[PDB]
Amino acid sequence: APVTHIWYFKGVPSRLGYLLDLAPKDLEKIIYFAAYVITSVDEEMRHNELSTLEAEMAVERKAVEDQRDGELEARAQKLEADLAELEAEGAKADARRKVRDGGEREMRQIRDRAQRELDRLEDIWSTFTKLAPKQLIVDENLYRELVDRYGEYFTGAMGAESIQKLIENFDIDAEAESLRDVIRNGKGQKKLRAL
Amino acid sequence: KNWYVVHTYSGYENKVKANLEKRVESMGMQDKIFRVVVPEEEETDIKNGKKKVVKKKVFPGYVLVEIVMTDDSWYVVRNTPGVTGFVGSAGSGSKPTPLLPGEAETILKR
Amino acid sequence: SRMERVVRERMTTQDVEAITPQTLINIRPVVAAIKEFFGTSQLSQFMDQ
Amino acid sequence: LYRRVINRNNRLKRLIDLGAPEIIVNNEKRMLQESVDALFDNGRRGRP
DNA sequence: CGGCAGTCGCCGTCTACCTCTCCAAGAGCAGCATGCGC
DNA sequence: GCGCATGCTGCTCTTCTTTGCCATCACGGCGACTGCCG
RNA sequence: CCGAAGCUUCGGCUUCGGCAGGAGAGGUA
Questions:
Q1: Integer Cα distance of B108 and B110 in angstroms
Q2: How many CB pairs below 8 A link B and D?
Q3: Range B3-108 classified under CATH 3.30.70.940
Q4: Which of B12, C14, C34, D5 could form a disulfide with B82 if both were Cys (CB 3.0 to 4.6 A apart)?
């Protein structure tokens, strides 16, 4: 398996980090198998299946919400039937109101649960849509989720074998003229970074 | 109650096994650790009329031990005389990660 | 302290009713520490006569 | 340090050409990287 | 976005000569050799 | 008389780093950097 | 490279044998 020369990555400064435009902490995380990175993301198919998967994810979210509705329905119905067959006739209606409050707390719990699942799917969508090369993706769960749903288009892994791919698919000239353009018309500290 | 992995030195897989096994009973935790299996294969060392079938550990140094995730369970498991430490640095290396159940079943094919 | 750590770790892997003080005690760490102090040390110096 | 590098490389080769799960291979690759780093410059990262 | 100040790591710290001592071991895995039992 | 069991003995590695062990280390100059406040 | 032993035509030829790293402490100018 490929490895990385220590001289060109753990220095002051980091020459590999200066060439690849990455913080040294990110390089240390990628190299020592603690986080993922996206080597390349196809922009053609993605730019069409964008709307395609938009439709698909709308469908999915609808399904999710409807399943929530159905579970709610079932549980609520049963609970209410039970509490209606007996409005705590031994004391007062207030004991039935209290068990109904418990039931509504349960309802709100399930609500929050489903809502959080909805926003996690939202997060998924967000991350998958705006995805560019050189974007550290931590959390193995998220990575595997993305590689399950939209496993095509984007590619990436961790380790020095995943940095060999970034270096191999690198164009020196475009970055050189980009840096020269930044130095030509710029100020602040971005000029110092470009220098 | 998922199947986790652990790391031992070298040749200490069965010493680690016995140690953990007995400890779980003596230390009193017969409700978190449940099953321990050390994957092993086979090597035909026939001496032209004298078979052997010696231990050929497919994964030397790795003992997969099912364990309910807690804190004292982690203590007893990792501090058993012989184990170097846990596996699963996926998230920097804070907590172990449960081995993919399908991968566990495929490991337990034999 | 090293011998105490060893005996504490070994007290939970042996079987009861066969545990005796002579089987729980290891002498090697103590003699190793003593012979490391009296030999390769910066304060036990060769005498000048 | 050469013996360490050779041992880790041999274990990695045998584990890769066996159908091992991904977690164990990643652990072995990290350990090999650390061993090579210690060969070229001992003490720069982590402990000597 | 945009300054901003603490902070954290890495670099360096004179030349030549003399004498002495000390520098992983126990655990483990086979491989038999002979004694004891049926 | 033969098979099984247990002790001399070749014989080649093996020695981590958690909820642990470990205890610290000057002093000045320089440069990135990095969370933090505005 | 040194030693031992033979042939030696006196240029030499043949046999055998043989090695030297680190850490710490104290001292002189």
A1: 5
A2: 24
A3: yes
A4: B12
